[PDB]
Amino acid sequence: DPLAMDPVAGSSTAVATAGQVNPIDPWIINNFVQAPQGEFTISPNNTPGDVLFDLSLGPHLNPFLLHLSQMYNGWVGNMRVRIMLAGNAFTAGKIIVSCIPPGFGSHNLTIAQATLFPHVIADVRTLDPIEVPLEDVRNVLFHNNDRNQQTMRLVCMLYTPLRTGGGTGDSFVVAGRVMTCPSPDFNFLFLVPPTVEQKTRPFTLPNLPLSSLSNSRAPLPISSMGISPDNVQSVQFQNGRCTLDGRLVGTTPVSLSHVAKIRGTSNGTVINLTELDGTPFHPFEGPAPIGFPDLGGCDWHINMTQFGHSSQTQYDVDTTPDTFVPHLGSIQANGIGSGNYVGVLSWISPPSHPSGSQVDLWKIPNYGSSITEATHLAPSVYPPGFGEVLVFFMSKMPGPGAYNLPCLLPQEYISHLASEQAPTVGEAALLHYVDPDTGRNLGEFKAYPDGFLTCVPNGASSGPQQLPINGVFVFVSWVSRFYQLKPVGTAS
Amino acid sequence: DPLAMDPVAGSSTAVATAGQVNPIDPWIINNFVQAPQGEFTISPNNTPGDVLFDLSLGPHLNPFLLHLSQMYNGWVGNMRVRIMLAGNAFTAGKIIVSCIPPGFGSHNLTIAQATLFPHVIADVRTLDPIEVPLEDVRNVLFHNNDRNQQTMRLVCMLYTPLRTGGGTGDSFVVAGRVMTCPSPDFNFLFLVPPTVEQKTRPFTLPNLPLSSLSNSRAPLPISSMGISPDNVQSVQFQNGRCTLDGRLVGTTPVSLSHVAKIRGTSNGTVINLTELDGTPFHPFEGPAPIGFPDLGGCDWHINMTQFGHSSQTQYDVDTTPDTFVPHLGSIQANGIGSGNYVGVLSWISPPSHPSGSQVDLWKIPNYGSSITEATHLAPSVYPPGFGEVLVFFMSKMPGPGAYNLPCLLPQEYISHLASEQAPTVGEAALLHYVDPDTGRNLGEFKAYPDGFLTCVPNGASSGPQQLPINGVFVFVSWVSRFYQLKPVGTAS
Amino acid sequence: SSVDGASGAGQLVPEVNASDPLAMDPVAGSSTAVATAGQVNPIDPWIINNFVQAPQGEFTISPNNTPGDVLFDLSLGPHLNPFLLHLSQMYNGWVGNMRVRIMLAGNAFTAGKIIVSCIPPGFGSHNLTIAQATLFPHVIADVRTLDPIEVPLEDVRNVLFHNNDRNQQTMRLVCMLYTPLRTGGGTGDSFVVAGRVMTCPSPDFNFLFLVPPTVEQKTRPFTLPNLPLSSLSNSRAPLPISSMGISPDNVQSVQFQNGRCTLDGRLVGTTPVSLSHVAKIRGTSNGTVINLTELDGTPFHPFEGPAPIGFPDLGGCDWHINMTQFGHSSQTQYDVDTTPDTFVPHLGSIQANGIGSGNYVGVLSWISPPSHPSGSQVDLWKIPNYGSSITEATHLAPSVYPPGFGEVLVFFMSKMPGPGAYNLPCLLPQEYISHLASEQAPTVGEAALLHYVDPDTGRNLGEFKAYPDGFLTCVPNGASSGPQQLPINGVFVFVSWVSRFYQLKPVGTAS
Amino acid sequence: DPLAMDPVAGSSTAVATAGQVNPIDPWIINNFVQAPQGEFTISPNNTPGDVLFDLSLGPHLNPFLLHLSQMYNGWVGNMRVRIMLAGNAFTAGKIIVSCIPPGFGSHNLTIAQATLFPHVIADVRTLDPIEVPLEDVRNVLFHNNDRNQQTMRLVCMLYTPLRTGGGTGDSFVVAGRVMTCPSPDFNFLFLVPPTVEQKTRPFTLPNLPLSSLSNSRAPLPISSMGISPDNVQSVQFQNGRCTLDGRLVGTTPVSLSHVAKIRGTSNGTVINLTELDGTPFHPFEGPAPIGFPDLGGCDWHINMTQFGHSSQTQYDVDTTPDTFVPHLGSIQANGIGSGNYVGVLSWISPPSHPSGSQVDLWKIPNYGSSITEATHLAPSVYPPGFGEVLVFFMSKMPGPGAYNLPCLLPQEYISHLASEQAPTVGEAALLHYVDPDTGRNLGEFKAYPDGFLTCVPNGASSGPQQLPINGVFVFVSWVSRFYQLKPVGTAS
């Protein structure tokens, strides 16, 4: 049935107040395209009430409009949404799509309450799409490019529990797709220099094969993707950490030239640390100097050089003694004279002080417990999704064995995100790992806002380790935190 | 919904420039027939993004039009495509059919981008067909018979992953069919003598039972079809190699009268090779004289005769010594006088020099490593499809055991293709092996452009070896590289 | 919008340009494509009349310029207007005419004339003499003319419309200096005429087919990463940038092999993508000779290049790297002299002055003055001798030199650890390279005008030119002055595409 | 050519919903008045892209309107802007003014980009004033006095370099003046009791000459203005810290009567501090008692007194001891009897504990490093800006040598700011150090919100030290990010 709403006016409001009223190409006007937040999934893992997707009106709901968004600074108009479900005859269920007006705020709604808004309900079996108009309910004359604005939203919820019958293969998920096109009322407003506004920038990942990239914890080329041992779950690296917004975290630097390095003046007993610039490090600033190595379960030794002096020495460091207070810019000097050096991690050994034990590169070293100053550490991470695991980028590390350093994101990705500070829309970013030569999808992954990927392993023996390093990660769509990925690899 | 396109004009453009504007039979005008590239398959082996088929506008999309194509040299007009899917209630999924305008070029598109073109989406379950108009977007007044022209294309992709539920039988594939008919705007242009232009010739295989044909590596009648041992995968024969275009490769000749033969002048120590004509062989020309035997893992001996001399001798040849340099037209003469002879392979023995080992007819002999000249060898082959295996034609070879020579294509097929240099449309040619007496389909195979068949064996014990040699291979349709064949034979 | 100084310009300069009409008939716009294009996409009417500064919006005339010099070469297309350029990325094809307006207005004391000629598609590239330019429909104007000259760029077509490929040849507008520029009065040679080019589409102009917004390369804008210089690194060694520098009066041409990338994103020489491959080598030690391979362990090949990708390119230096190994707890030093006949990087063969057998991964980390020549000075501007394997094509990266009026090469330098105050110069920061490679943006025009700016205040600190081959140039103020006097907080901002001869303003402070 | 803008409505919109629509004195209605930031000069040294001026639509542009805003609580309307240049017929160069809509951002632009906005490009030779309409582009019906309200902006940049001919006197510069005036569209909205609303209050500094004032760190007359040595960059005092909003930060009090003083109970070993009222101090409310001296690298000592006891006892203090826990209200009693006294810093000496070394008044003493509590220190202030340096107010303090005590704001200023809590609009307050008698401007300064001044020193020796202490600081206007100060000091 039709929505319980009266038609909302378009440009007619902002005529005498906006500097310009700019029309759009009529070919976009009714061509239904997949919205950037165009995917979702329903599986028996979902419970009635789960929000499959939450959209908010704006040009960011259509790729074409989005591209134009970077050229104008305002907009007004209504859109049109179309939803599709790829179900089976075995999939019983109903979904509710409700329009939530601005000003209502956020609350936990029971499926019953979700009905109280103009809505549309559909059986997951339908072969045909569902159409819902997204009206531009306004309190103001028009909208500016600002995702802080409260616009009308479309919330899709599981109305009844998904109940698969038959030979119930819990690996079965109903694929959902969202598509939109602007109602002819739609109009952009003020013309503005392209791409300058950041609020309108699309999310982008560099078009470069994984192999040619490097590690973010140590200057090492990536050799393969890996998974944490069944034991490890939460991680807390300090380098190679960046938000999809492009905000650096922990001790993560922009360029590799700062990764896994330290600079300071040796007192022949203790080394006073300084930023690579030579600038004074400050304990409140962070956990340690920017670029300072974060290899935990290790007894690492860096190669130290000096300016104006022909020399190369080895500084063996154990991260256990109380003399190891990087947080206060003071560490040991096992056997180094005075002066200032520049060290680069280039050789790791199994931790000495614990008990002469095994290497656990998944850990983070202890930064002096300086309680008088601000121990501003980088938060931990873990897979929030359905049977997802953290995906790591690994490079073989030189040492007394088969060591391979795991990191969250390649340094180049970090460098890219920092430049294009593209706002993150949605709870997660669905990525498709594609082979550049064929364009075939090798896998499906999810990049979370905090800056880390996850995936679903086909089996304990299976995973991304089995995939070639020629692929490139391509952004496909923004998705919900609870999107269920297709398992990667081959189990046998 | 309707396509996001404006109607494109027909003949009205090329009136004042083409010599003639020729109309077609109105009965063809709206009769939906299966296009020559009328088949495709979707299976869980496919990944969203896979191109199920790629069509390009032209009379070659309709059998009737195609037949007329051989009579005119130009065309203009729009067509109409109709797609069908034979799915189940267990098959969940969606496909995208998009129209790609000329000039766009080729790129790897994510399912999201595929949506940005005028498109049509369908659930794999539909009982009804899908219709899409293929407009003749033109930059020029009209089109000439040239498949190098850039015309509008229709690309079908898997929009969402195919997810079979229930008692998941991975042998289940959704059968797809494409059909077309010309929009009344369609018109052929200049009348031209029939079949003369090659660009318009249909692909054809000789209507002859397999049994009556011969081998392409040795003058032996075909006795059965076979499969490479689980160990063998890639092959590199040099004789019996021809493209579907009709281009001969390696040392492959047109007639059997040149197969497995050699001619040259014996120096009582070394035999200098020449082409069977008597013409001088040239090392840059190829790997060895045209017709020169390619039986690898063998210690073969040919029967040598002479002109103007009553004699028949036996020249036993081991393909291991450094004296074996066919590439330079110089080989051994184990015990032959001087003069010129003509030898025909007629008896093989297990290889002597390796260690007195077993016969491996799947190999190719070593042609002298002449690095100063061009060792122009014929590339290797292997099954590109889903669990496909190379199909071979075998004839029993005379020798000290149960030997059967495997070859890629019967010589007669080669002779045929060479004559009718029919352009290959599509990634592969779907063939149906039919019993001439009943017309019943015995099997389904794929002939690839390079000149070799493949198939899917029902089981390790099953395969084409179990099929009668009375059948004839009939061309059915051009298909994608990733078309999935129905397994052949019977497993028990 | 436009306010020419007519009111107060006295009558020393001509207001409007008096010139004979263009010897050319009007060309049709969209009317052509209407019947065969899949769509005819209209554009925002506000763009239709705004004369905006084209991406190739600047040029300069100076007394150094000689008649015949090309001030700008415009080829018809959406890439001539910033708005259109952005929309280009969304459509496949176009048809229509453009309205061009060149702006001049030199002092009443300057004299000189330029000539603009329209060249038909299909003519090809040829070096035209000023007299040849006359043969094409042209317009001539005095540099003093107040009001901007308007020239219609007609879309001469052989076909119904255009597509976004390289198979297309459109009409061009070449502007050259007609007569030498000469300022009278108290000639301040700092005086050059600053020209501006603005365009807006004629209402005939239309885009054609809607297409996925970014996919096509022809439409991609040239962009530089928005990152302060200090945060970036060197390309010849994994060292952070310290400051910019100039080659000594003596040094002119350079041939670095690492840290070389075309503005289109084409990697040249041994230049790798990531720093993880910079100044490193991998190979198997034979205790006497080390057999090189790519860092991937993959086999190097003499036809591939001068040396393995990432192989250090420091010339006048006696460098020694730090070598490590997998599975073997060790760290050794490899002292290398680039002079010996045993130093044949081009053949994957080098010395081993004291290294046991095995396979290592070395990182340049310590350099010293070249031993073998005469125990003399360090010249980092040089490139080492790559084995002159006569039996293999030594595919080297070409040399670069400043083509502009009194321009010099600009280098990015980082201090290198050694027996003194050394600083390694490179052409581009590694990250810039990484960026260009990703965004293979077509380069339009002979050079890119850049403005070095302080991100905080937005103050223009310097003016530079980036050339296609991948290198910057600038005009140093005094001999003592130059880019070394500038802070490393700035970022490079693309201003407009320019001709080879755009004359830059001297950088730094001379005293 | 015209301006790329449609005219925007004035009061028309307000009428319907504003309570009143108040007219303006017609004499103001079209009288062009110079704007606060109405001056700029174009020297041949400027490069195209340099920003000449920045404007924001608002009553603040016109002193008359401004004075009126304090009587009404809303406004809507359009102003008219006139730019006037002073040049010969012997010059050349163009300027460009771009109209930037509200809701864009403050990111820097290229002259090319400036063209993308509705703009006006004028040639320097123009005689007549350039009129540009400052239109009220609104998102709402009208404006309520808020800082949240973003208005139309006008940015002016040099388009083409100034090239003067003739016997070129490089002292030659083209001066520019900016003037505005409302248009009949403009109207104030609701009559509200004058000066009661905070939002309308103008920023003000006391009209008193520097000399007659005092330091905010110690009760001492200001004797000179100084700058931190090239070595001292970041500063962090705790007294004499006050935001322009009128918010007291750190231990900063209002009256000098609480400056550099402490009151507490002497345990004969440790002194237990309290606020001057005899009220209990609390480690959580702040890092130390309000008024507690913040002199860093100094071995200072007060003169204590007590009520009901005729006594004066010198109390010596070292800021290094672990007994010095000001944050916990516990300090040393190096030789003091028990009781409760009131001490006032009156004599300073070089710090004893470091090594009996020199005095550093730029430093801040150590306030007991308590981890349990929140040592909420007042954040460090550094000079934000290209070449801007921190300005200090100094007074000579008694001790064994020359002790010039630095200060950020004269206490009197602080007292004033708290009284008139004037909201801070903009980034910085342009100030003029004027000689009261002559009414002559002696220097151009910048006042930042956090509570401090900056300036651009002329020569290495030249600066504020070369200025007389008879001047008064006068507020000019709220400046932008782009505003570059005029170098202060007498350089020759």
From Swiss-Prot, chains A, B, D:
Pfam families tied to this protein: Calici_coat, Calici_coat_C
Keyword Acetylation applies: no
InterPro entries, alphabetized: Calicivirus_coat (IPR004005), Calicivirus_coat_C (IPR013643), Rhv-like (IPR033703), Viral_coat (IPR029053)
Entry annotated with the keyword Aminoacyl-tRNA synthetase: no
Residues covered by region (P2 sub-domain): 251-377
One annotated Gene Ontology cellular component of this protein: host cell cytoplasm
Family membership noted in the UniProt record: Belongs to the caliciviridae capsid protein family.
The name this protein goes by in its record: Capsid protein VP1
